[PDB]
């Protein structure tokens, strides 16, 4: 409908509206009018994406500032869902206003999801797709073909047609979801990737991952095209701290350094060949480096660095080269002795946990290498690779690795740590030493986002506690509130199972994963659930080796044979193509009434993004708490830094992370208040963690279900599914769970 919040005409694309949705819109408009940070959890079920999209389009069109809108999600599954909801909302707004207004909206992802080249489309890696698409379109190949038309080098017609048509005429006005965008670019023979990369400054909305905002290696080009005074929305912003961690984290193995030695030797051979043939490119590169010209001063806009900048752009050094790495051979020797120093550093029999300052002091006392030449390592290496004009870059990837490590550990000294450990897996017979350069402070990658932008929306369906995140990230909110979603009848039934059918306490600790009693209890409850679940299951466990051991044990003991009678069994696979095939197989088996059970990682690919609405999720079997591996040294480093700086207890953060992964798994089952589904939690340690739960989840959890065994939980589920199968009374839900236009107007008059 079309209603007013203050002076804002809101074109809601549904004939009805939830009350929680409208109070959410009131709070969001208050936040936008005030300006600043805000953390709000909007319960899953109720429409979240379309409501934000409606308020942002109303705010952008109506207000004379016309600030652009930034919408950051976690996966392009959710980005595509948002684009589809935006397509519906723009169709509604065009229908109501009678015209298609001036509006641009696109989603943003990698080349691998946006490559229409028929030859380079079967590659299993995005890196090889990027290196080929650069190789032909760095501009070196085009000018070579201009100079030599008989050259065997090839160009992508999809990119070359983009030069013919004007920038603003790449697409017609409106929204293009990735399916529609790929269909249009297939019809028009265009590259969608370069189109999206060129519409960043022109789109009213651009939707990209947290990687395209937090990780500077790809966000460096993105953030230069967006508006500083733009409204930013963080959707599903509950694992954004994890993304901030991996944005500034790094790992290297001894195979990587062996390939680094091989790449350094190949680079030495290549530079010897260049010095033999033509040293003029080396010469003018040398004088450009003497002049102090940086990489961006010499690299063209249509080409990218060979190794991307791993650090924040505000943390980069604006001064010239120190000159030690200015010559090509000098830089080659410099990087080779980097490789040998780090190789020497791996020969150790215990854990090394030292600060970057301690590492650089050990560096400067073992070799003569300073922080400042390392702070230009990636830039110098990328410039050298560009000026060498090497045809293949397959052998130089470990050079990217070592340049990234050098720049990352040089520029950064606080909030970071280096972990050198001899057994990368403790099950390996032969020692395989590892180094881990980790980012202790998760607030670093989100700090320039808060510095640049003014109005920030942080939102997850299941984020709890609300004040936990202003502690881990140094920012201040203007308001935090959690909504209790109201029901005519209780649509969701959460349980806690603490013991099996024989009242033996069940636990998912990794040391007791092979307990026959606990595994047998788990098999018993899943068999009974598969006997009583109508449509479909998703089942979450803590770890991948946990499914491997436990389904090996039930397949040995014949539980899964009995499961095969009722539902088709689907398991998450590390091959994400096979995992997506299993996912669509599961959805097909849920659609036709075949019945299916999905076994997944609670911290994995299926847990994020993928929603099990309606028949896709009816019972959410939570086997155990998805705790991380505590003995992993990186997690202990997390806990130590949080306790030292932000005064957060180790068990508190451990439990919080485990149950927030549990909660993001639980929130994928409800879409709409007509959707129903239970969230059963099978571990003895969930019983003490109700106070941490999401508030809409917490109000649905009764006192009687805090400690149940299998059988009365099964009876409660049976009664619940008999209850929600009944047709509800519209008079029971006419104005208390959903509002029409008249109910919303009446409540607006009551509030006034």
């Amino acid at each position: 409908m079309k209603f007013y919040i203050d002076d804002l005409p809101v074109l809601f694309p549904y004939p009805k509206i939830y009350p929680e949705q409208y109070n959410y819109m009131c709070d969001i408009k208050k936040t936008l009018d005030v300006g600043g940070n805000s953390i709000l959890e909007m319960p899953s079920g109720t429409g979240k994406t379309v409501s934000l999209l409606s308020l942002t389009i109303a705010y952008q069109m109506h207000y004379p500032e016309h600030r652009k809108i930034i919408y950051c999600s976690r996966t392009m599954s959710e980005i595509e869902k948002a684009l589809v909801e935006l397509e519906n909302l723009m169709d509604y707004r065009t229908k109501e206003l009678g015209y298609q207004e001036d509006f641009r909206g696109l989603g943003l992802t990698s080349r691998k999801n946006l490559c229409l080249h028929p030859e380079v489309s079967k590659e299993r890696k995005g890196t090889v797709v990027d290196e080929k698409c650069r190789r032909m379109t760095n501009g070196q190949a085009k000018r070579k073909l201009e100079e030599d038309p008989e050259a065997n080098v090839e160009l992508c017609e999809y990119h070359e047609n983009l030069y013919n048509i004007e920038v603003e005429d790449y697409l017609p006005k409106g929204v293009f979801s990735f399916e529609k965008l790929l269909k249009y670019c297939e019809e028009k023979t265009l590259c969608p990737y370069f189109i999206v990369r060129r519409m960043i400054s022109l789109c009213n909305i651009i939707i990209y991952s947290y990687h395209y905002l937090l990780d500077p290696k790809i966000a460096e080009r993105v953030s230069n095209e967006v508006s500083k005074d733009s409204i930013v929305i963080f959707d599903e912003a509950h694992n954004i701290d994890n993304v901030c961690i991996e944005s500034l984290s790094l790992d290297l193995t001894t195979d990587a350094l062996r390939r680094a030695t091989r790449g350094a030797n190949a680079l030495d051979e290549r530079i010897s060949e260049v010095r033999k043939v033509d040293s003029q490119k080396l010469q003018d590169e040398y004088e450009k480096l003497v002049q102090g010209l940086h990489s961006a001063d010499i690299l063209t806009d249509q080409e990218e660095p060979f190794v991307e900048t791993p650090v924040l752009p505000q943390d980069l050094l604006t001064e010239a080269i120190p000159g030690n790495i200015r010559r090509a051979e000098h830089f080659v020797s410099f990087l080779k002795r980097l490789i040998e120093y780090l190789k020497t550093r791996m020969k150790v029999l215990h854990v090394i946990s030292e600060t970057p300052k301690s590492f650089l002091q050990h560096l400067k006392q073992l070799t003569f290498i300073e922080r400042k030449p390392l702070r230009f390592c990636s830039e110098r290496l990328s410039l050298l690779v560009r000026t060498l004009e090497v045809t293949e870059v397959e052998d130089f990837t470990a050079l990217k690795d070592i340049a990234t490590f050098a720049t990352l550990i040089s520029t950064y000294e606080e909030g970071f740590l280096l972990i050198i450990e001899p057994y990368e897996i403790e099950n390996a017979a032969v020692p395989n030493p590892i180094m881990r350069f980790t980012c202790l402070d998760a607030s670093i990658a989100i700090k320039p986002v808060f510095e640049r932008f003014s109005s920030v929306i942080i939102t997850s369906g299941t984020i709890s506690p609300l004040d936990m995140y202003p502690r881990m990230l140094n920012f201040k909110t203007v308001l935090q509130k959690s909504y209790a979603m109201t029901l005519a009848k209780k649509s969701f039934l959460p349980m806690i199972i603490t013991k099996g059918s024989d009242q033996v306490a069940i636990s998912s600790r990794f040391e007791i994963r092979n307990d026959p009693s606990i595994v047998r209890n788990y098999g018993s409850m899943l068999v009974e659930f598969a006997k009583i679940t109508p449509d479909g299951m998703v089942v979450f466990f803590p770890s991948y080796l946990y499914m491997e051991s436990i389904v090996s044990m039930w397949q040995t003991m014949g539980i899964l044979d009995e499961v095969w009678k009722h539902k088709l069994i689907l398991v998450e696979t590390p091959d994400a193509q096979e995992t997506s095939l299993a996912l669509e197989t599961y959805r097909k088996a849920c659609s036709n009434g075949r019945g299916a059970i999905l076994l997944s990682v609670a911290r994995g690919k299926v847990s994020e993004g993928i929603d099990f609405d309606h028949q896709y999720g009816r019972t959410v079997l939570m086997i155990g708490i998805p705790f991380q591996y505590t003995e992993s040294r990186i997690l202990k480093a997390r806990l130590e830094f949080m306790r030292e700086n932000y005064r957060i207890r180790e068990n508190d953060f451990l439990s919080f992370d485990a149950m927030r992964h549990a909660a993001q798994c639980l929130g994928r089952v409800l879409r709409g208040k007509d959707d129903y589904g239970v969230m059963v939690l099978a571990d003895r340690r969930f019983s003490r963690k109700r106070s941490q739960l999401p508030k809409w989840i917490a109000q649905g959890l009764s006192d009687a279900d805090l400690n149940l065994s299998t059988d009365m939980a099964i009876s409660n589920t049976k009664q619940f599914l008999r209850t929600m199968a009944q047709p509800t009374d519209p008079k029971d839900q006419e104005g208390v769970s959903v509002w029409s236009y008249e109910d919303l107007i009446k409540h607006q008059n009551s509030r006034k």
């Binding site: 449509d535 009722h566 539902k567 036709n592 009434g593 075949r594 599914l721 008999r722 047709p727 009374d729």
Partner: protein, 383 residues
């Protein structure tokens, strides 16, 4: 911090914690009749062809319905066939079970209640087993409803107590074929809301989600049957507006037994077909000489009442002056039923009829509205 025994006694005697009792039930009665206050003559499917799909599976061995699911469903299906032939005699009925992964047609489509009851009691003896498949049952129903004429409505009922169906092919193609063949489907599941059955009921019945019903207890199942006997209202876009040629046979009377045209057996009675003078055993049956739907006036008589649904009797306010002390149709004295002297007069048991302004009691209302189908007040009015 002690054991469960060392705390306290249960105090079960103190657990029980302890004229306006009329209103506490009668306001519930108003709330129950609130859903039934809307009534209008819907055009419904009068000539019907029902396919009763029966689950015959290991899920029918479940110990939730007494004594198993199988016996209660088979006896309630016997009851359903009896009452449906008592309310819709001109219809043609086929019975099918779903057993061992194949849809077993246990009786052909027919207008004989007795043969279908015999088929049901024959299936009553056997043990339900196998994994049920919906798609086989819907394909069999599609086959058997193919010779059904355009005027006769194609209808299918399924009692699917299982939760999963294992189909040999795509069931959505079968759903599209049934929608294309204008076959309306109502599904009566026993355990939960199966999504494929929900989609089947929505698509086959023109977007209506109210045709997928799940019981709550023992009595609600019989409620599902006795509102399943009702003719379904047809959609406005359905144009099967035809004339149907049928004749009225006369009961022949003879002391000499003669060969009936249907069975070739000696029957003293019979009904001579007006088109070709052929005798049959039972009515309403088709004439097996000239394919004529031989009937009685009683068979269409049983179906007039759906076309004239009685408007619900509106109970008079207690404040307004009552018309008479006794009821109209049974002249039972209306109970004074005064709660107290301060409790005043509540729940006046007089049910007015809007077309005749005649009051009726509660027993008269609950007799006139389903057993009778006329208002005696509307008939005493000299129009």
């Amino acid at each position: 911090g002690g054991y469960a025994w060392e705390d306290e006694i249960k105090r079960s005697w103190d657990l029980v914690k302890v004229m306006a009792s009329l209103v506490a039930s009668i306001v519930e009665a108003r709330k129950k009749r609130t859903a039934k206050k809307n009534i209008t003559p819907y055009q419904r499917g009068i000539i019907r062809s029902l396919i009763l799909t029966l689950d015959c599976s290991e899920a029918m061995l479940e110990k939730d319905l007494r004594p198993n699911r199988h016996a209660m469903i088979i006896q309630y299906a016997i009851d359903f066939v009896h009452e449906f032939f008592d309310q819709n005699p001109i219809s043609q009925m086929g019975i099918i079970i779903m057993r061992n992964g194949l849809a077993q047609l246990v009786s052909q489509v027919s207008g004989n209640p007795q043969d279908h009851i015999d088929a049901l009691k024959s299936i009553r003896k056997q043990e339900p087993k196998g994994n049920p498949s919906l798609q086989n049952a819907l394909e069999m129903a599609r086959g058997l409803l193919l010779p059904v004429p355009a005027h006769c409505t194609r209808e299918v009922l399924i009692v699917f107590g299982s939760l999963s169906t294992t189909d040999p092919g795509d069931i959505h193609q079968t759903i599209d074929s049934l929608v294309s063949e204008k076959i309306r489907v109502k599904v009566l599941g026993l355990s939960a809301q199966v999504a494929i059955c929900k989609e089947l009921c929505k698509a086959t019945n023109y977007g209506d989600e109210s045709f997928y019903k799940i019981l709550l207890d023992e009595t609600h199942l019989k409620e599902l049957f006795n509102e399943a006997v009702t003719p379904l209202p047809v959609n406005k876009i359905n144009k099967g507006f035809t004339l149907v040629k049928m004749g009225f046979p006369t009961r022949i009377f003879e002391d000499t037994p003669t060969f009936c045209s249907c069975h070739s057996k000696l029957v003293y009675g019979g009904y001579f077909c007006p088109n070709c003078h052929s005798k049959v055993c039972s009515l309403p049956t088709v004439c097996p000489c000239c394919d004529l739907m031989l009937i009685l006036s009683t068979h269409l008589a049983r179906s007039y009442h759906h076309l004239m649904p009685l408007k619900t009797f509106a109970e008079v306010p207690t404040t307004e002056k009552f018309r008479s002390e006794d009821c109209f149709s049974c002249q039972s004295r209306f109970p004074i039923l005064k709660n107290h002297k301060n409790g005043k007069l509540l729940t006046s048991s007089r049910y007015r009829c809007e077309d005749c302004k005649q009051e009726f009691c509660v027993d008269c209302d609950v007799f006139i509205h389903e057993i009778l189908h006329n208002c005696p007040g509307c008939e005493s009015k000299p129009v």
